[PDB]
From a paper:
The YfiBNR system contains three protein members and modulates intracellular c-di-GMP levels in response to signals received in the periplasm. YfiN is repressed by specific interaction between its periplasmic PAS domain and the periplasmic protein YfiR. YfiB is an OmpA/Pal-like outer-membrane lipoprotein that can activate YfiN by sequestering YfiR in an unknown manner. Previous studies suggested that in response to cell stress, YfiB in the outer membrane sequesters the periplasmic protein YfiR, releasing its inhibition of YfiN on the inner membrane and thus inducing the diguanylate cyclase activity of YfiN to allow c-di-GMP production.
Author numbering:
A (entry chain A), B (entry chain B): 34 to 168
Amino acid sequence: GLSAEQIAVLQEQGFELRDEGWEFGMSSKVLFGNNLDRLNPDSRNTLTKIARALLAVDIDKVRLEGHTDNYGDEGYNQKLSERRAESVAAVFREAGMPAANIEVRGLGMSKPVADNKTRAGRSENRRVAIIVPAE
Amino acid sequence: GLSAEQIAVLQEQGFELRDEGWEFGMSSKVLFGNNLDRLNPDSRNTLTKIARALLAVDIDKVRLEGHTDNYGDEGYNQKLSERRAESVAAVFREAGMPAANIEVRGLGMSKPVADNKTRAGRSENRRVAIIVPAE
């Protein structure tokens, strides 16, 4: 389980404890914009600070999951979700996180957090999740 | 939002982060034994240490929630669950927590955490939970 100086850091960064562990989503929109899986460089820093802060307190084990809405090919949403997840993973590596400690899952359309019949609904399902397991 | 020192103390007392806050649960058999809402001496002593720990790091509020299984009259089980939480509240108040910062709830049979079908799940649901709300 996580130590008190860690949990606090997680809380500070915007993490919320859920069933699979501590979770913090960012929208694809903010993360990539018009790109497919290239991060615009502002989101890169945002993702660097985050990773640096976590490693600072010996959190060094994260899972990254990316989802899409249901619009589009089913096969493509899987790849995209996985590639987009990996894009973020590469920023964690480049900051000091043991690659063996990073897990990457493409979850495609299958796992939404909103009704997929709204511009703010569908744009909410387009996201990448940062997960520290509470193990 | 709880600080590292607060969280540290919470973990040392056996609390566990849930959905409604930090939460330590004790079974009714331990707290009450054969009694109704009178705690046995060993329990009051335990509860007093927990209470003093929470005060010594300036915790803002505690909620005390009594639960039963689903055997018996539902209104009796509601009252009992309430009287039982009020027994734990009293110990808090006597340890120096002000009434106004203490929330007492009898929840009867409505929030189980185990299966009422077995003798075991029934004894597990017979508990009073101490919650520190997540501001």
